[PDB]
């Protein structure tokens, strides 16, 4: 029902989701996505992409039972936090990362 | 290579000691140390990662790498010769998981 309402939404609008047609993740890949994120790590859906640094989402994940807009909406929520948590684990690494500071014992 | 660099500086020590102990003679090690390379301590310097479950894959690796770091080159993994002074160079399955290679 919610794809066909998805489908129904990009045929009045052009079919302009192309990733945002369902990712169709299993509720056990989302998991499993979560739990990769979960490291700080850049999934799927999380990946490091070129103008992300961090989580960017794969092709619009479907939820159990709908489609991918507020599935992958609240993935993307999700996403933000792993996207933080990738960087803020980069910047985690800042003292052992700036080796060569000259920044003291602050860094 | 860093066997023949480590040989020369042996020598190289040797050549100095002689030259400044006049005539003090010094422990000369069996040769058989450092001419085996099954002998040095360093990582020793799989099945296909697209086909192995990933889990299966990762014990796998993990396997590897208790061996690399215990100095035996692993399955997935594994520290080679390095070039002079250096590190034991680790090459990877290129077919693992991103994040688990990764990690």
């Not at chain 1, 992300?52 to 993307?76: D, M, N």
């Not at chain 2, 102990?21 to 360093?42: F, H, M």
Request: glycine share 8%; net charge neutral; hydrophobic share 40%.
């Amino acid at each position: 029902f919610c794809r066909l309402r998805q489908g129904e939404l990009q045929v009045l609008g052009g079919a302009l989701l192309q990733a945002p047609q369902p990712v169709l993740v299993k509720e056990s890949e989302l998991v499993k996505d979560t739990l990769n994120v979960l490291l700080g790590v850049v999934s799927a859906t999380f990946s490091l992409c070129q103008p992300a640094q961090a989580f960017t989402v794969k092709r619009g994940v479907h939820v159990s039972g709908a489609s991918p807009e507020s599935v992958s909406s609240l993935l993307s929520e999700v996403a933000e936090c792993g996207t933080h948590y990738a960087r803020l684990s980069d910047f985690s690494l800042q003292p052992v990362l700036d080796s060569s500071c000259s920044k003291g014992l602050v860094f | 290579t860093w066997q023949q660099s480590l040989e020369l500086t042996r020598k190289m020590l040797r050549d100095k000691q002689s030259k400044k102990n006049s005539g003090q003679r010094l422990p000369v090690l069996p040769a058989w140390v450092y001419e085996r390379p099954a002998l040095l301590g360093d990582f020793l310097p799989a099945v296909p990662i697209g086909s192995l479950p990933l889990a299966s894959q990762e014990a796998a690796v993990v396997e590897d790498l208790l061996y690399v770091l215990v100095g035996v080159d692993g399955r997935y993994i594994s520290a080679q010769p390095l070039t002079g002074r250096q590190g034991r160079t680790f090459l990877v399955d290129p077919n693992l998981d991103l994040s688990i290679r990764e990690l």
